[PDB]
Design a protein around this nucleic acid. Structure first.
Ligand SMILES: [K+]
Ligand SMILES: [Mg+2]
Ligand SMILES: [Mg+2]
Ligand SMILES: [Mg+2]
Ligand SMILES: [Mg+2]
Ligand SMILES: [Mg+2]
Ligand SMILES: [Mg+2]
Ligand SMILES: [Mg+2]
Ligand SMILES: [Mg+2]
Ligand SMILES: [Mg+2]
Ligand SMILES: [Mg+2]
Ligand SMILES: [Mg+2]
Ligand SMILES: [Mg+2]
Ligand SMILES: [Mg+2]
Ligand SMILES: [Mg+2]
Ligand SMILES: [Mg+2]
Ligand SMILES: [Mg+2]
Ligand SMILES: [Mg+2]
Ligand SMILES: [Mg+2]
Ligand SMILES: [Mg+2]
Lengths: 252, 132, 137, 45, 569, 303, 101, 196
RNA sequence: GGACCUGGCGGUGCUUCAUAUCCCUCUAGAGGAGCCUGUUCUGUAAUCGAUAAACCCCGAUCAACCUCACCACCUCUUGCUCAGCCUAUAUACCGCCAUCUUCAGCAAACCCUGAUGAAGGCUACAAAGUAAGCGCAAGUACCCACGUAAAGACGUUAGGUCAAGGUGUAGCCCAUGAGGUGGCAAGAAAUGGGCUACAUUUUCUACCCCAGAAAAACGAUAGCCCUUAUGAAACUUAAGGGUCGAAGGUGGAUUUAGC
């Protein structure tokens, strides 16, 4: 029946089934826009309508309704299928991400420069590194278990200026944006001895984390907790040793 | 919760036209009717035929101007003249717009045995009444 | 400047047959829109006055036809949606107009009848007694 | 006359003057099922 | 309701996007709409069963599918008549052959209709929805074969054969068949005599006297046969006599007087033919002026009805001759004739209408006061037609003549609307007119805005795919306008394009640049201009270097550069 | 923005001239009422919400009051109280406090504007408590013997806030009477009360004791005349249609009271109004609602 | 191409009822009077019973013209309650609005 | 690159143009053609009604721009040729009734749709006051008895409503025939009439 | 394992409340009788779905055949459909909704606090919150500005519906598809809702409210017989009449509705 047909929007909504009790608490399908490659006036009969799918005027004469031969139509359909499969293959293929500390870990991954500020402020000089991504859950009165992302990011210019921030968001990308934008407003400035290391050995305890950092000569490298290596590359420190005792809590 | 012809709220990134933005209970209060005919007046006849014709016309125009209609059609019936006022997008080429206008007029006229006119009003992009 | 020097006039021929006489011409227009009915009333009254026809206007009481349907698809019987259709009226009573005047005026206003407005024109024609009823048989 | 409506719109689609989004969706699903191996069996098997 | 002067013709969608913006787009849009209608009708006639439901009261026959396939398969005269009324040449020929072989009689009228069709269409299938030079009347054709095989041949059969031969340019065979008609002692008709006259003039390249004598003999033969000549006969005579021009001039007037005497009222086609015969290249003032004046006098205020297929060219020809003669009063009279009553429908196809109006408006701009010219411009464009670049150039010329240059921005905007945005000729004309002479500050700033828009159009030209071409005169004029209006920054930025395109700057432009540099106290800019002049090696640069040295205090570096330039000198 | 509003005003002037030309009226004397009438005629919309209907108004009436930028090119704000974020409101409070200090040193016609009105004046968003604070301060100013110098200011925030006797007509015979109407439920009654009479009451051409055989309805008829002490002084002719006996009696009572108002003094009319003899009973049958037995009765709940 | 086999069956029933309406009308008229002989009425009864079953008008079911719903159909528009609500809510039925009073 | 839409043609409209020329007939609201800053649509909070461009609400409105006061006056001036003058003699209802006793009522229904048919158009009503018919006492009494409810004594009017025939002309002829036969029979006398 | 944060819960505390609402208080009811109807159970060869509030005169604004999707038998196979399927999955969904809601909150984007932990963000003589948007409100329909409708977001119950239709997945294709004839659709019994009653503020009659009779009769819309209406088909549907005059005598805890 013609009258029982629906539109692509409604059909895809129903088929994909994003909204629903399943998606309520997580208790795949890809939306393909079937009108992408179709051309107005192109049908399986291979008719050439002047002014719709073929040029109206051919060599100064108004064209007339014509039909592609069977082999020509077969060629056209083959080309259409070729384009469809090429598009599908290029969609399926994915670019290899440059991993951070481990293949599946968000830590150590770059996020790019912080977003430009309002008053003609730009931070293209700054680089952002993710130090942690968590999925913190809080039980709410109505919405059962609620999923949220807490991200720790560190921004720095490699010339002393470096800061860090925690971003909370229901979405990972919003969390990243919040954290990396808040970091640039909370920049420390770190004094580097000869622009490659720290001025003296530092033994400190923040809460239950002990950090023992040793000044080192040029070319020694960063022998530090991977997170400290990331933060030191952001700050601009090239050479330093660092031992982390006690709790290894990333934020502390 | 009432669901009939309501575009449920979102994060504020969903554009909606004036028709979509208004729920059913706003018909005759804030939005008019997309098809005007005498079928539904007291003592008039052929309401069912008019409704079926309207449904077919909407589907046919949607499939004939794919990705061009920027808003719902307006079907006006005066005597036996049928006027389809359609808001469309300035994407398709004017040659194809004219071809399809002539085509639709002729085909619908022969199909429903009545003079059919198709008035296109083009806009650059869908008019956004609000962001839901 | 590019005005038509001469304009062709439509051919109106005075026939040799007597003309109908209309005592009353009650044009009852039904619509869903009071504003549309008011605009049409203004138009028709102005046209009648221009043509010299005597016209009065009344507003018969509206009709509201309501009915009820089940809101839910399957079982929620107690929950309903009630729809209504409003038919608003406007009666233009024209008096003492001839057949030709009635024809021209009706053609005008009917061609200009708005979409969604129906019309019922009752014509009260004046006649004489047939010759076969004048005298007893 | 559902026969008339369906046949007319199908013919218009085949001629290319009517874009049946629903039928395109159904054809896409059928093609994907055919690739997946869910194809309609013949009438004698 | 009169015509809407702000709106394009009604056939177009009344939307700014879909409104045609040129003559080419107007024609193409109308062709596209007609093509869509043709496709719809093709579908309707190819699948009629979807459109057989009649829900119309009163019934509307014109909205019903047309059936072309024959419905009588029985081999009989009735089925052959069905086919012949359907105009199926091949099917009718095959059915006639089959019936003749079967031996059943075929009526003379039926065979005559078969002739009619075959001889008119040249044994070629009439064009359907879907499935010039030379002679098409083939030597061996079904029409001639059936004519020879015909048991009884009649005056109408011979007439139709002759008419078909003439229509398909078989003039010699038509004359022959006329000869056998006479030998068989038959009487032809007025249409056959018209075809025979056409054949007589289109057969051999004989001299005017021979052809005229032949035509007179044919007319005398018609008179003897008592056949009454019609309007078509005389129109064919005049159209054929067009070729001889001067030799045919006076006898054409004789023919027209004969028309008047007989009572066959002359038509627009007749007047068109006479006018075109008399409009030979050379001097029209000798006879064309008088003939056109007399024709207009006669036709004054005469509603016309369609009497000849060629009546729809008289207005085109009249406007052409009026433009040639530069008689604005005669042009106005012709226009009034067109506007009188319903005469406007005789203007003709789109090309004819465009040519008529283009000539009319060019003549108006040439020979009318500027205010009336602008009134006509507004009334005609775009409502009547979409102007040509030449018509816009003539409008600009008229504006210059009348010394009303304050509307040049309006003319440029109208040109952009009508599609002359990227027309080199129009752009050059506008720029030359604007930059020719200085004007008050308001006119100067308006001209500067117009020049900026023209520069934007030049930049955004579709030719950008090809290397951008910027005429040197246009560059000079744009720079001059900017400098005069005070956009010295833009002029200085534009100066680089001179070097970029190797375009020679203008002496006036250089002088204005020097004046601005002196006003601003810019020795660096003065040295830059002098460097450009030296690079282009203009002779005036020799004195301009001294002028700059005198006017502007010269730094040591500037003096060193000037010494280098002088060494180059 | 200001340039946008200026362009809109130019557009409105041109369009107003065009609309005047369209309707044939004089462009010069074309008013906003004329524009509204012309638009209502040309674009008939039956939408119940008047705001949803087509409107061609001045840009000033259409667009909301946009607060102008509050600082210059140098960046310095204009008002010294800018950084409060409520500069206008706090400027008003500061001025009121200064006036109160000066007053302290030296020494049923209107209401207080609503918070919405104050917000509209101050082109700022206020709070309930802010509005209450400002109103308390203004009330203190009013009580503090505010003279003309202060009352001129105060009045900027002040907003300004009996039966209609029918005319006495005369019949052909010169007798004076009064005509009135009254509706009760579905009953509508038209009553004519004569100035002089013997107490006769003819309802629908029938004597009242016959039309209303019910003592309650006769008592209702009596109630107006008995109240004003005019029993037997007036003749009444009533015509009542629709409703039942009690609705008809109530409608006739209201109509009779309204008609008699023309013949009783103003004090008596006010006394009748206070007794409720001139109020149109708005109590009408409440519509049945779907899914329930009646207007308020619900279907028997099944736990 | 109807919505379903039930709608197809109803379409066939309507066609056959239209075809046999006149014959049934005449025979039922013969049967539905006390004037004619009861023997003639009995033969008329057997004829009307012998007519095909689908010609009986009572077997026609008023179904929605768009979803073949056999109940909850508004005769005026020939649409089930669901489809009618869809159209009315979207505003595509002229003059139909939500009722509030 | 792409096609740039032209500026709306309202910019070219003079304030004193010919609006009937602009819109001769009923046509949908065209924003590019209507030179008004008309807005429609319920405004959003602190918003304004949607402008005319793309305004589907204005597109829905059955506008009257083709019927302005000027256009109506001109149209009626043109149509005055088609009108005939009402007989001055019968200037009053009493004269109308006296000269033309029979009144014929027929209704035409103007709806929207491909079919103009309407079964209610076939009904024809014939009204006549018996005082207008030349009937004696006996004939009048017999006519009243024959017609029955069709005769309203209060108004003394006989009303014959004919809808049996498919066509209005047939119904009118049938009503005239009914009047004729009723009159003639009422004048006639039967034998059984004596047993009154 | 220790200490916390958020939520749920407390036969958890104080205070103020519920406005037809939680208890008492007011009116009419159900719970007792017969009948109508739905459901469960039983029965049959003989559907499906809802099934605590939020099912139970519910999908149905409706089942003699059809409707029909059920059963028995028979018949057809490119089949009305460029097939079909009322086949499974509502725990994949769109569509339309119940529910709290007889709520007023949901809130993106920012800022701050907590040592930069989960998290939290208020005091008006104010102490870190600002908030677009949605909702409420406002506006609107009906008879006012009251009232009733309508509206009522985000979420809860994997709440309801694959049997309105569409649809993902899965399943049958000589059948889980299609057509024809016939048939069940009942009561052991329980239970929900409604109608009628048990009467004297009542019953019958006239009238539509100034009467006369009745009164151990009141009380069936049930039972049985007949007739009529619709239909092709009526013991199985409706109406009317005839006949009969049944249970019952104001109903237990409990429970519904109404400002
Ligand atoms: K009870
Ligand atoms: Mg890995
Ligand atoms: Mg609800
Ligand atoms: Mg049925
Ligand atoms: Mg309660
Ligand atoms: Mg009970
Ligand atoms: Mg069940
Ligand atoms: Mg179950
Ligand atoms: Mg069966
Ligand atoms: Mg059954
Ligand atoms: Mg099945
Ligand atoms: Mg669910
Ligand atoms: Mg509600
Ligand atoms: Mg509200
Ligand atoms: Mg569930
Ligand atoms: Mg379930
Ligand atoms: Mg089966
Ligand atoms: Mg009984
Ligand atoms: Mg029977
Ligand atoms: Mg008894």
């Amino acid at each position: 029946s013609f009258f029982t047909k629906l539109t692509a929007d409604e059909l895809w909504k129903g088929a994909l089934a994003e909204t629903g009790a399943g998606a309520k608490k997580g208790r795949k399908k890809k939306r393909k826009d079937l009108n992408r490659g179709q051309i107005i006036g192109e049908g399986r009969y291979g008719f050439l309508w002047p002014g719709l799918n073929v040029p109206l005027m051919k060599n100064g004469a108004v064209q007339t309704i014509a039909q592609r031969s069977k082999e020509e139509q077969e060629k056209v359909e083959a080309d259409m299928i070729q384009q469809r499969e090429e598009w599908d293959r290029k969609k399926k293929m994915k670019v290899k991400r440059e991993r951070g500390w481990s293949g599946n870990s968000w830590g150590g991954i770059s996020l790019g420069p912080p977003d430009p500020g309002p008053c003609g402020e730009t931070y293209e000089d700054f680089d952002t590194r993710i130090l942690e991504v968590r999925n913190v859950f809080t039980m709410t009165a109505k919405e059962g278990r609620k999923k949220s992302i807490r991200v720790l990011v560190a921004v720095g210019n490699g010339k002393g200026a470096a800061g860090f921030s925690i971003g909370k968001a229901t979405d990972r990308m919003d969390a990243f944006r919040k954290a990396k934008n808040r970091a640039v407003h909370h920049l420390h400035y770190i004094e580097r001895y000869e622009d490659h290391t720290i001025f003296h050995d530092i033994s400190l305890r923040f809460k239950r984390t002990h950090i023992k950092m040793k000044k080192q000569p040029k070319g020694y490298g960063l022998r530090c907790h991977r997170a400290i290596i990331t933060i030191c590359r952001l700050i601009g420190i090239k050479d330093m040793y660092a031992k982390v005792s006690g709790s290894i809590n990333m934020l502390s | 919760k009432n669901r009939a012809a309501r575009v449920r709220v979102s994060k504020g990134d969903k554009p909606v036209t004036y028709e979509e933005a208004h729920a059913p209970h706003y018909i005759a209060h804030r939005k008019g009717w997309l098809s005007l005919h005498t079928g539904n007046l007291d003592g008039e006849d052929h309401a069912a035929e008019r409704t079926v014709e309207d449904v077919f016309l909407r589907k046919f125009m949607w499939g004939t101007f794919p990705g061009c209609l920027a808003d719902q059609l307006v079907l006006k019936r005066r005597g036996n003249q049928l006027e389809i006022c359609a808001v469309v997008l300035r994407q398709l080429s004017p040659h194809k717009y004219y071809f399809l206008v002539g085509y639709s007029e002729t085909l619908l006229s022969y199909f429903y045995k009545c003079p059919v006119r198709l008035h296109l009003q083009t806009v650059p992009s869908k008019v956004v009444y609000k962001y839901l | 400047v590019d005005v038509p020097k001469d304009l062709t006039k439509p051919v109106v021929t005075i026939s040799d047959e007597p003309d109908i006489l209309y005592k009353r011409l009650s044009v009852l227009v039904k619509g869903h829109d009071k504003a549309v009915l008011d605009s049409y009333e203004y138009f028709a009254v102005l046209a009648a006055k221009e043509l010299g026809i005597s016209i009065k206007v009344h507003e018969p009481p509206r009709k509201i036809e309501r009915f009820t349907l089940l809101q839910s698809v399957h079982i929620y019987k107690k929950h309903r949606v009630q729809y209504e259709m409003r038919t608003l009226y406007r009666c233009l009573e024209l008096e003492h107009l001839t057949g030709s005047t009635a024809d021209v005026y009706l053609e005008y206003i009917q061609r200009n009848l708005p979409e969604g407005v129906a019309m019922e024109v009752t014509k009260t024609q004046l006649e004489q007694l047939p010759e076969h009823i004048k005298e007893p048989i | 006359n559902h026969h008339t409506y369906a046949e007319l719109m199908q013919t218009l689609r085949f001629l290319g003057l009517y874009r049946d989004e629903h039928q395109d969706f159904m054809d896409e699903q059928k093609r994907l099922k055919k690739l997946r191996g869910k194809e309609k069996p013949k009438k004698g098997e | 309701v009169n015509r809407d002067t702000t709106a394009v013709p009604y056939v177009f969608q009344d939307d700014p996007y879909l409104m045609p913006a040129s003559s080419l787009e107007s024609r193409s849009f109308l062709l596209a709409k007609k093509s869509g209608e043709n496709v719809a009708k093709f579908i309707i006639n190819s699948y009629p069963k979807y459109f057989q439901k009649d829900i119309a009261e009163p019934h509307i026959p014109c909205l019903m599918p047309e059936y072309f396939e024959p419905q009588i398969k029985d081999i009989s005269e009735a089925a052959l008549k069905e086919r012949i009324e359907l105009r199926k040449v091949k099917a009718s020929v095959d059915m006639f052959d089959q019936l003749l072989q079967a031996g059943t009689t075929v009526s003379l009228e039926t065979t005559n209709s078969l002739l009619d069709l075959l001889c008119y269409y040249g044994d070629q299938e009439p064009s359907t929805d879907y499935h010039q030079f030379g002679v098409t009347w083939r030597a061996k054709n079904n029409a001639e074969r059936i004519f020879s095989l015909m048991p009884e041949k009649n005056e109408h059969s011979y007439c139709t054969m002759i008419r078909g031969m003439v229509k398909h340019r078989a003039y010699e065979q038509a004359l022959n068949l006329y000869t056998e008609l006479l030998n068989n002692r038959l009487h032809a008709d007025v249409y056959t005599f018209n075809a025979l006259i056409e054949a007589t003039v289109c057969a051999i390249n004989e001299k005017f006297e021979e052809k005229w004598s032949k035509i007179l003999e044919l007319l005398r033969h018609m008179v003897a046969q008592k056949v009454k000549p019609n309007l078509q006969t005389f129109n064919t005579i005049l159209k054929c006599l067009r070729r001889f021009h001067v030799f045919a001039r006076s006898p054409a007037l004789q023919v027209l007087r004969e028309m008047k005497a007989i009572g066959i009222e002359p038509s627009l086609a007749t007047y068109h033919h006479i006018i075109r015969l008399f409009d030979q290249p050379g001097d029209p003032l000798k006879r064309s002026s008088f003939i056109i004046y007399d024709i207009m006098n006669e036709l004054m205020g005469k509603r016309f009805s369609p009497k000849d297929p060629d009546d729809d060219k008289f207005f085109q020809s009249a406007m052409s001759i009026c433009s040639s003669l530069r008689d604005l009063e005669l042009a106005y009279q012709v226009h009034g004739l067109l506007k009188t009553g319903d005469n406007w429908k005789f203007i003709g196809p789109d090309q004819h209408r465009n040519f008529y109006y283009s000539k009319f408006f060019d003549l108006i701009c040439l020979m009318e006061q500027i205010d009336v010219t602008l009134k006509w411009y507004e009334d005609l464009i775009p409502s009547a037609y979409f102007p040509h670049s030449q018509t816009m150039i003539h409008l600009l010329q008229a504006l210059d003549v009348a010394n009303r240059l304050e509307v040049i921005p309006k003319i440029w905007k109208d040109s952009k609307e009508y599609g002359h945005t990227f027309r080199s000729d129009l752009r050059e004309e506008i720029l030359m007119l604007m930059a020719r002479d200085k004007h008050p500050p308001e006119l100067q700033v308006a001209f500067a805005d117009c020049a900026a828009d023209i520069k934007s159009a030049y930049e955004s030209q579709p030719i950008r795919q090809t290397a951008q071409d910027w005429p040197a005169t246009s560059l000079n004029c744009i720079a001059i306008l900017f400098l005069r209006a005070g956009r010295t920054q833009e002029a200085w930025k534009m100066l680089g394009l001179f070097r970029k395109h190797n375009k020679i700057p203008r002496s006036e432009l250089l002088n204005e640049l020097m004046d601005s540099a002196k006003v601003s106290n810019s020795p660096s800019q003065a040295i830059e201009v002098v460097e450009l002049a030296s690079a282009f090696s203009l002779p005036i640069c020799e004195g301009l270097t001294q002028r700059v040295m005198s006017d502007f205090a010269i730094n040591q570096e500037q003096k060193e550069a000037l010494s280098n330039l002088t060494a180059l000198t | 923005t200001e340039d946008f509003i200026k362009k809109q005003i130019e557009e409105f002037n041109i369009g107003k001239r065009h609309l005047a030309n369209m309707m044939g009226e004089d462009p010069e004397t074309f008013t906003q009422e004329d524009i509204d009438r012309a638009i209502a005629y040309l674009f008939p919309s039956g939408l119940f919400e008047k705001r949803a209907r087509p409107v061609m108004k001045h840009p000033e009436q259409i667009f909301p009051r946009q607060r102008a930028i509050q600082w210059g090119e140098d960046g310095r704000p204009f008002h010294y109280l800018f950084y409060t974020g409520k500069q206008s409101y706090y400027s008003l409070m500061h001025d009121v406090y200064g006036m109160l200090l000066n007053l302290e040193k030296h020494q049923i016609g209107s209401r207080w504007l609503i918070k919405e009105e104050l917000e509209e004046m101050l082109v700022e968003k206020l709070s309930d408590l802010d509005y209450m604070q400002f109103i308390r301060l203004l009330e203190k100013l009013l009580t503090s013997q505010c003279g003309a110098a202060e009352e001129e200011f105060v009045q900027r925030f002040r907003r300004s806030v009996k039966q209609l006797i029918e005319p006495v007509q005369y019949d052909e015979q010169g007798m004076a009477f009064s005509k009135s109407e009254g509706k009760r439920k579905t009953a509508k009654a038209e009553a004519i009360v004569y100035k002089h009479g013997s107490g006769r009451i003819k309802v629908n051409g029938i004597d009242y004791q016959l039309y209303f055989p019910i003592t309650q309805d006769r008592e209702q008829l009596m109630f107006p005349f008995h109240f004003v002490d005019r029993l037997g002084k007036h003749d009444v002719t009533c015509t009542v249609s629709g409703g039942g006996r009690s609705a008809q009696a109530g409608a006739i009572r209201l109509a009779m009271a309204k008609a008699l108002c023309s013949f009783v003094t103003e004090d008596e009319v006010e006394w009748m109004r206070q007794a409720g003899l001139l109020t149109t009973d708005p109590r009408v049958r409440e519509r049945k609602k779907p899914g329930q037995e009646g207007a308020r009765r619900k279907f028997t709940w099944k736990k | 191409h109807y919505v379903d086999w039930r709608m197809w069956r109803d379409v066939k029933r309507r066609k056959m009822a239209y075809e046999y309406a006149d014959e049934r009308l005449r025979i039922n008229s013969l049967r539905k009077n006390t004037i004619l002989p009861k023997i003639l009425q009995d033969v008329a009864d057997e004829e009307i019973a012998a007519l095909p079953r689908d010609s009986c008008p009572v077997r026609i079911r008023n179904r929605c013209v768009m979803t073949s719903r056999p109940r909850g159909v508004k005769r005026r528009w020939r649409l089930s309650r669901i489809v009618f609500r869809h159209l009315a809510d979207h505003g595509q039925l002229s003059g139909i609005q939500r009722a509030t009073w | 690159p792409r096609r740039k839409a032209l500026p709306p043609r309202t910019e070219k409209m003079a304030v004193d143009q010919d609006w009937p020329s602009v819109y001769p007939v009923a046509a949908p609201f065209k924003p590019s053609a209507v030179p008004l800053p008309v807005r429609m649509g319920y405004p959003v909070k602190k918003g304004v009604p949607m402008a005319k461009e793309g305004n589907l609400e204005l597109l829905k409105i059955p506008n009257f721009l083709h019927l302005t006061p000027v256009a109506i006056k001109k149209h009626c001036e043109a149509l005055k040729d088609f009108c005939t003058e009402w007989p001055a003699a019968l200037d009053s209802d009493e004269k109308c009734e006296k000269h033309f006793p029979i009144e014929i009522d027929s209704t035409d229904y103007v709806s929207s749709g491909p079919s103009v048919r309407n079964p209610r158009a076939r009904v024809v009503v014939l009204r006549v006051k018996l005082s207008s018919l030349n009937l004696d006492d006996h004939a009048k009494k017999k006519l009243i008895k024959l017609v029955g409810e069709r005769y309203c004594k209060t108004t003394d009017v006989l009303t014959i409503k004919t809808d049996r025939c498919p066509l209005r002309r047939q119904n009118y002829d049938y009503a005239v025939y009914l009047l004729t036969v009723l009159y003639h029979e009422s004048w006639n006398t039967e034998e059984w009439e004596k047993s009154k």
